[PDB]
């Protein structure tokens, strides 16, 4: 699961279904540790990098 | 979860790109009227000089 | 989810994003509009100096 190379374990919608043109509104990552270090990366990504929103 | 967040942005860059078209169609539009209008002056600018060349 | 604030996201997704195309918009239907008279009165200059 983790660096998987298959795309099909990732659903279509939430991963850039109907991407608009100045966003992309997707990203992947595999942070290391526990889960809250990735949404202290996804808040330190909250900010100057894209407006605030949500993915699973 | 973003049901009203990239769900909206979906919406709102979707309606800034409809008036990105619009606009686009509108300076084609405007293109087409003023060659029409330009192509009249000339066209009445042709007759004035025939006129004057009939008169004299 | 993650460490951030409650329903701030309501302009930040709208503001700096649908502008991004909207003053496209509006620059193009300016300087496309502009440009397009000039031309058609360099058309208009040029067919009556032809019948002139």
Redesign the interface.
């Known amino acids: 699961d983790l660096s998987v190379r298959s795309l099909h374990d990732i659903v279509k919608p939430?991963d850039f279904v109907?991407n608009?043109?100045?966003?992309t509104?997707v990203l992947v990552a595999v942070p290391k540790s526990l889960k809250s270090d990735f949404?202290?990366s996804?808040?330190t990504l909250?900010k100057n990098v894209v407006?605030?929103?949500?993915?699973? | 979860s973003q049901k009203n967040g990239i769900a909206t942005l979906l919406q709102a860059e979707k309606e800034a790109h409809e008036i990105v078209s619009k606009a686009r169609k509108y300076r084609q539009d405007k293109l087409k009227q003023a060659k029409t209008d330009a192509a009249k002056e000339i066209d009445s600018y042709k007759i004035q000089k025939d006129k004057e060349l009939k008169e004299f | 989810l993650t460490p951030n604030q409650v329903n701030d996201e309501l302009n930040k997704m709208q503001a700096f994003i649908r502008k991004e195309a909207e003053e496209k918009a509006k620059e193009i239907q300016l300087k496309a509009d502009q440009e397009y008279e000039i031309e058609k009165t360099n058309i208009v200059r040029n067919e009556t100096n032809n019948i002139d």
């Not at chain 1, 608009?20 to 966003?23: A, F, K, N, P």
């Not at chain 1, 407006?51 to 699973?56: D, L, R």
């Open positions: 939430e109907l608009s043109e100045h966003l509104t949404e202290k996804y808040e909250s407006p605030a929103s949500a993915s699973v």
